[PDB]
C-alpha cells in the first residue's frame, strides 16, 4: 500500500533552461518632433513581453508574487551555454548568439534602411571566444539590465561541483566504510570535467517531534513500513516439527501454541523496524502463559523501557513479578496500583534481598538510551553492555538463582512447571546470546544509514505485537548468521536521502514564498493554499484529512526560520526594481492629479504632446487602496466639492483619446462625477490626452501655433530609451559538463563470508559450533 | 585499465587473485578494484591466520593497504612477499627512441612463484586461531591446492612474460600511463580456471 | 573557416572513432593543441609557392 507511495520518490528534477527568462523585448515605435509631425524614421524602445497585469495595486502586488513564484519554480540548476546557440547570419566573423530571439533582433537591426552603419558593424563584430584551457566560454547577449542581472545571478550560483572517484568514495556514510564486514568496489572512472548535485543535509527546523504528533506519526508509519520492507529475512531455521517434538519431550506432558516460522520472521522484522524508526509498540499476552512471560522478560532485558507504552509495560511487569518473582521467595504478593509514577520493577528492586535477581532488575529499570551525535546526524545507541551480549549472563545467573529457592506457599506441580519453563529457556543460552549479538550488530549497521534527526517521543498510533512470536523466535533461532544485503541497504539509503532532500526543498520553497508575501505587504490572501500545496508536494499525505487550523499553526511556526541565501537575494533583486517594472507597463497608470489651474503639457519623443506629471510634489496624497479598503469617501468628497487641488496615487486603467476636439472641449476632468454619484472607485477611467500628426487633427496646433493647456495630468513615466551598445554583454559559463544523478549505482559491494562476520569487537558474530 | 569483478563468498577467487596481483603490476588497474581486493584478501586470509584485529581502514588514504600490511607483520616470508608486491610497478624504459612499459626482471624468469608457494605453505600449517573448523580446513586445503602447482605456475607466468615481450617488441607508437574512463571486465572465475 | 568542421573530418578519417558523440570542449582543446604545431616543410613550401 503505502510502500509504493514512499518508494516511488525520484530526486527532484533539475530544470534545463531552454531560453533566458525574458520580461523585456525590443519594439519599434514611431517618433515625433517637438512640433508634432512624423520623422519618417522609427526608433526601437523597450516594452514588456507580457501585458496581463490587472488594475488595482493589490492585484499588482499579487501579480508580483506570482512572478516571483514562477521565477523560483523555473530556477536553472545547471546552466548549459552550448545548447542555446543559433548561428548569426550577419556576423562577418561567423559568430554564434545565445537565443533565437536574439538572432531575430540582430537580423532586424542589421536590416533596417533607416539605421546607421556603426551599430550594424558592431552587430557584425559579435563573436564567441572560447578558452578551453580554463573551462570558460563567452557569449553575446542582448537584454534589459534587469534580465541581464538575473541571468548573471543564475550563472554565478550554480549547484554543480567537481566530481572525483574519491568524492563518491567519501559520499557513503562513514559508519559503513569504517566497518570491515562491508567492502566497496567500483568499475568505471570519472572524467575531470563531470559534475553532480549535492542533496540537502540539514536537520529538522519545524520541530515535528514536538506538538505536531499527527504528521509526525504519519511519517513514522511510512518509515516503519519502509524498514519492514528493507530488513533482511531469516535463513536456515530449524525444522518446526522437530523442535516442537523435542520441546514436548523436554516438558513431560500427558503452552506451545503459536510457534511458526512466519511468526518469527514477522517478530524480527517488526522489532527491528520499530526500534529503527522510533515507533512505539504495545504488547498483548494471556496472563496464564508462563513461557510467554519469560520470553517477554528476555525481550525487556534486551530492549529498553522507553520504547513501550505505560499500559503494556505495567501489565507485563505485574504479571512477571506476581507470577514468578515474589512466588520464589514466598513473600506477600505486591498490589501495584495502575497509575503510580513508580514501576513494578522499581518496587521489586526496593523490596527483594537476593543479589543476582535484584541486580538484573536494577539493570532493566534504568537502562536508557544515549544520545550521540555522529557525522551531523543524531542517533540512539544502546549501552555498550548490550552489543557484546555479556549482560545476558547477568540475566541467566539471576534466573539460575530462581531454580534454587524452595518456592514456599506453592504446590509442587506449579514449581515443576516453572522449573520446566526456566530450564527450557536456560538450555538455549548460546542461541539467545547469538541472537542478541546479531540484533545489536544489525541495528547498529542499519541505523547508521539514516540522515534525519530522530527523537524518542511516543506517538498516537501504536504497533501491535504478540509475545508468542517472540517465544517462537527465541526457541527457533539456529546457527546461520544474517547480514543485510548491500543492494537492499543502498536502496534504502537512496530512498531515505531522496525523502530528506524533497522535504528540505519544499520547506525552502514555502519559506521563500511566505517571506515574499509578508514583505510585499500582502494581507488579503488566504494563506492555507500555500500550506496545502506544500503538504501535497511532500507526496505522503492527503490534504483531505488534515484541517486548516494545523496549516495555519504550521505557517506561524514556519515564519521564524530565516530563508536560504539565494532566494533571499532573488527576492531583494525583484523588489529593488519593482517600480521600474510596474511603471513601464503600458496598460495601467499610477494615479491622477487634479489642480483646477491652467497648466501646460509636456513634450516627449515617444508620445508627442502628452499630459504627464513626472513628480507629485506640492499636493495632498490619498491612497486608492485605502479608499477601496475602508469604503470611506469623506475627505475626498469635501476636497473635490470645494474645488481644491487633490492628488490620487494608485493603479488605474487608461482610455486613450487622440482628438484635438476633446482637447479644446474639456473632457479630461468629467470622469470624476461618478465618484460622488456612484460612491465606488473600482472602475475609475481617466482620459489620457494625446496630440500628434497621426490623428489628422493636428492642423489646429500648427496653423494657430498654440500651446495646449489642460486641467489634468496622468501619473505615467515615459519608457526609457534603448541603446544597443549598453545591453550587449559577455555572459560567462562553463564549456561542457555531464550532469550526474543517481550516483550510488556506480558502486557495488560484496557480502563477507557469513561465518567470518565481525560485528564490533574483533570477534565473530555468532559462535555455536 | 582492468576492473576486478569477484564474488567474495568464493575464497578460492581471492586465492587466485593473490597470484593475479603478484604477476600484474597494481598500477594497471583502477584504485577501487585494488583497494577492494587488498582489503578482502588481508581481512580473509592472513590477518585471520595471525590473530590480529581486522584492518580498520578509510578509503582514499595516500598509502595503499598493502603498505600498512607490510609495516604491521613481522613474519619474514609473507612480509617480504608483501613488500615485493607493494613496490612492484611498471618500469619506465626507452628502446630505440620508443617509450615502453616493461615488467621487472625478477618476475620475468619465473621466480616469484616460488616465493608465493613458500608463503602459502607457511600459511598452510599455521594455527589459524579463532576460526571455525570447516572454514579453516577448506581455506588451508585450497591454499595447499594452489601451492601444489609450483612448476606449472612458474611455466605459465614466464610464458606470459615472454609473450608480453615478443608482442611489445613490435609496438611502434609510445604508450603513456594514465587512468581512463572505461575498463574491461576480468572474470575472477576465469582467472582461477587458468591458474588451476 | 570553422575549425570544428576540419577537426571533425580529421577525427572521422581515423576509421576508429565516431564524430557524432564527441564533446565540444575536448574538441576545442584539441584544436588549440593543433594550432601551435609547426607544419611539415613540404606543405609549407607548397603554401609559399
Amino acid at each position: 500500500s503505502i510502500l509504493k507511495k514512499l518508494e516511488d520518490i525520484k530526486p527532484e528534477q533539475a530544470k534545463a533552461q531552454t531560453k533566458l527568462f525574458r520580461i523585456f523585448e525590443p519594439r519599434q515605435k514611431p517618433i515625433y518632433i517637438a512640433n508634432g509631425e512624423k520623422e519618417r524614421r522609427n526608433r526601437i524602445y523597450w516594452k514588456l513581453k507580457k501585458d496581463t497585469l490587472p488594475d488595482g495595486d493589490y492585484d499588482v502586488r499579487e501579480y508580483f508574487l506570482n512572478l516571483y513564484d514562477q521565477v523560483l519554480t523555473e530556477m536553472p540548476d545547471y546552466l548549459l551555454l552550448k545548447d542555446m546557440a543559433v548561428e548569426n547570419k550577419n556576423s562577418r566573423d561567423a559568430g554564434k548568439v545565445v537565443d533565437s530571439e536574439t538572432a531575430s533582433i540582430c537580423d532586424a537591426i542589421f536590416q533596417d534602411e533607416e539605421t546607421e552603419g556603426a551599430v550594424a558593424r558592431f552587430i557584425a563584430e559579435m563573436r564567441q571566444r572560447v578558452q578551453a584551457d580554463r573551462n570558460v566560454v563567452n557569449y553575446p547577449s542582448i537584454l534589459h539590465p534587469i534580465d541581464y542581472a538575473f541571468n548573471e545571478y543564475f550563472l554565478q550560483h550554480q549547484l554543480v561541483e567537481p566530481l572525483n572517484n574519491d568524492i563518491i568514495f567519501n559520499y557513503i556514510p562513514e559508519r559503513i566504510r569504517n566497518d570491515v564486514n562491508y567492502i566497496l568496489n567500483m568499475d568505471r572512472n570519472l572524467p575531470s570535467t563531470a559534475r553532480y548535485i549535492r542533496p540537502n543535509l540539514l536537520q529538522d527546523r519545524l520541530n515535528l517531534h514536538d506538538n505536531f504528533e499527527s504528521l509526525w506519526d504519519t511519517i513514522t508509519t511510512s518509515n516503519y513500513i519502509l524498514a519492514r520492507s528493507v530488513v533482511p529475512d531469516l535463513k536456515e531455521l530449524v525444522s518446526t516439527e522437530a523442535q516442537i517434538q523435542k520441546m514436548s519431550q523436554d516438558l513431560q506432558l500427558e503452552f506451545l501454541t503459536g510457534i511458526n516460522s512466519q511468526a518469527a520472521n514477522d517478530c524480527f522484522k517488526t522489532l527491528i523496524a520499530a526500534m529503527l524508526s522510533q515507533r512505539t509498540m504495545s504488547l498483548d499476552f494471556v496472563t496464564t502463559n508462563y513461557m510467554s512471560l519469560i520470553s517477554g522478560m528476555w525481550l525487556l532485558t534486551v530492549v529498553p523501557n522507553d520504547m513501550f507504552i505505560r499500559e503494556s509495560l505495567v501489565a507485563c511487569q505485574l504479571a512477571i513479578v506476581n507470577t514468578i518473582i515474589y512466588v520464589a521467595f514466598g513473600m506477600q504478593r505486591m498490589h501495584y496500583r495502575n497509575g503510580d509514577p513508580q514501576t513494578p520493577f522499581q518496587i521489586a528492586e526496593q523490596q527483594i534481598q537476593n543479589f543476582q535477581v535484584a541486580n538484573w532488575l536494577h539493570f532493566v529499570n534504568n537502562n536508557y538510551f544515549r544520545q550521540v551525535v555522529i557525522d551531523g546526524v543524531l542517533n540512539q545507541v544502546l549501552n555498550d553492555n548490550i552489543r557484546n551480549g555479556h549482560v545476558i549472563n547477568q540475566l541467566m545467573e539471576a534466573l539460575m538463582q530462581l531454580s534454587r529457592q524452595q518456592f514456599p506457599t506453592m504446590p509442587v506441580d506449579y514449581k515443576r512447571s516453572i522449573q520446566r519453563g526456566i530450564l527450557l529457556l536456560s538450555n538455549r543460552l548460546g542461541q539467545l546470546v547469538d541472537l542478541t549479538r546479531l540484533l545489536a550488530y544489525s541495528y547498529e549497521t542499519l541505523m547508521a544509514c539514516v540522515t534525519m534527526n530522530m527523537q524518542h517521543v511516543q506517538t498516537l498510533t501504536t504497533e501491535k505485537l504478540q509475545l508468542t512470536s517472540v517465544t517462537s523466535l527465541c526457541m527457533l533461532i539456529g546457527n546461520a548468521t544474517v547480514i543485510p544485503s548491500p543492494q537492499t541497504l543502498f536502496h534504502y539509503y537512496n530512498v531515505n536521502v531522496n525523502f530528506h532532500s524533497n522535504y528540505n526543498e519544499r520547506i525552502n520553497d514555502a519559506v521563500a514564498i511566505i517571506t515574499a508575501a509578508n514583505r510585499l505587504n500582502l494581507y488579503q490572501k488566504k494563506m492555507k493554499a500555500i500550506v496545502e500545496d506544500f503538504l501535497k508536494r511532500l507526496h505522503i499525505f492527503d490534504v483531505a484529512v488534515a484541517p486548516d487550523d494545523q496549516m495555519y499553526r504550521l505557517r506561524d511556526r514556519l515564519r521564524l526560520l530565516p530563508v536560504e541565501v539565494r532566494r533571499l537575494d532573488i527576492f531583494n533583486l525583484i523588489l529593488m526594481a519593482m517600480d521600474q517594472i510596474e511603471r513601464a507597463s503600458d496598460k495601467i497608470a499610477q494615479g491622477v492629479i487634479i489642480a483646477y489651474r491652467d497648466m501646460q503639457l509636456e513634450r516627449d519623443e515617444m508620445y508627442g504632446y502628452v499630459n504627464i506629471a513626472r513628480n507629485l510634489d506640492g499636493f495632498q496624497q490619498i491612497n486608492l487602496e485605502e479608499l477601496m479598503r475602508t469604503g470611506s469617501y469623506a475627505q475626498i468628497t469635501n476636497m473635490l466639492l470645494n474645488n481644491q487641488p487633490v492628488a490620487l496615487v494608485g493603479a488605474l486603467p487608461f482610455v486613450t483619446d487622440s482628438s484635438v476636439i476633446s482637447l479644446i472641449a474639456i473632457l479630461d476632468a468629467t470622469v470624476f462625477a461618478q465618484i460622488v454619484k456612484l460612491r465606488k472607485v473600482d472602475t475609475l477611467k481617466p482620459i489620457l490626452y494625446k496630440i500628434n500628426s497621426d490623428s489628422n487633427d493636428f492642423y489646429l496646433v500648427a496653423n494657430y501655433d498654440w500651446v495646449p493647456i489642460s486641467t489634468t495630468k496622468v501619473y505615467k513615466q515615459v519608457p526609457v530609451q534603448f541603446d544597443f551598445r549598453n545591453s550587449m554583454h559577455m555572459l560567462t559559463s562553463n564549456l561542457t559538463f555531464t550532469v550526474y544523478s543517481d550516483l550510488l549505482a556506480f558502486v557495488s559491494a560484496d557480502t563477507v563470508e557469513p561465518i567470518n562476520a565481525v560485528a564490533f569487537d574483533n570477534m565473530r558474530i555468532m559462535n555455536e559450533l | 585499465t582492468m576492473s576486478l569483478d569477484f564474488v567474495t563468498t568464493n575464497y578460492m577467487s581471492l586465492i587466485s587473485g593473490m597470484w593475479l596481483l603478484t604477476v600484474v603490476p597494481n598500477d594497471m588497474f583502477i584504485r577501487e578494484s585494488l583497494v577492494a581486493c587488498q582489503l578482502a584478501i588481508v581481512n580473509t586470509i592472513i590477518y585471520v591466520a595471525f590473530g590480529m584485529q581486522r584492518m580498520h581502514y578509510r578509503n582514499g588514504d595516500p598509502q595503499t593497504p598493502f603498505q600498512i600490511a607490510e609495516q604491521q607483520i613481522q613474519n619474514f616470508q609473507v612480509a617480504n612477499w608483501l613488500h615485493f608486491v607493494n613496490n612492484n610497478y611498471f618500469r619506465q624504459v626507452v628502446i630505440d627512441g620508443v617509450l615502453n612499459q616493461v615488467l621487472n626482471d625478477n618476475i620475468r624468469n619465473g621466480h616469484v612463484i616460488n616465493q608465493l608457494m613458500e608463503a602459502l605453505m607457511q600459511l598452510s600449517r599455521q594455527q589459524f586461531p579463532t576460526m571455525p573448523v570447516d572454514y579453516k580446513r577448506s581455506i588451508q586445503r585450497g591454499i595447499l591446492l594452489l601451492s601444489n602447482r609450483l612448476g606449472q605456475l612458474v611455466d605459465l607466468t614466464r610464458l606470459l612474460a615472454y609473450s608480453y615481450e615478443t608482442l611489445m617488441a613490435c609496438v611502434t607508437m609510445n604508450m603513456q600511463h594514465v587512468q581512463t574512463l572505461t575498463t574491461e571486465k576480468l572474470q575472477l572465475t576465469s582467472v582461477t580456471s587458468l591458474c588451476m | 573557416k570553422k575549425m570544428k568542421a576540419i577537426v571533425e573530418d580529421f577525427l572521422k578519417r581515423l576509421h576508429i572513432f565516431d564524430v557524432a558523440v564527441a564533446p565540444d570542449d575536448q574538441m576545442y582543446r584539441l584544436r588549440d593543441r593543433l594550432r601551435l604545431l609547426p607544419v611539415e616543410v613540404r606543405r609549407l613550401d607548397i603554401f609559399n609557392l
Binding site: 555531464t738 549505482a745 | - | 558523440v21 564533446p23
Partner: peptide
C-alpha cells in the same frame, strides 16, 4: 534488482554517450 539494473544502465549510458 531489475529496477536497480535499469538505473545503473541509465547512468552508464549517460556516461557512454561521451565516448566515441
Amino acid at each position: 534488482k531489475t529496477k536497480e539494473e535499469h538505473q545503473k544502465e541509465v547512468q552508464y549510458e549517460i556516461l557512454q554517450k561521451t565516448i566515441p
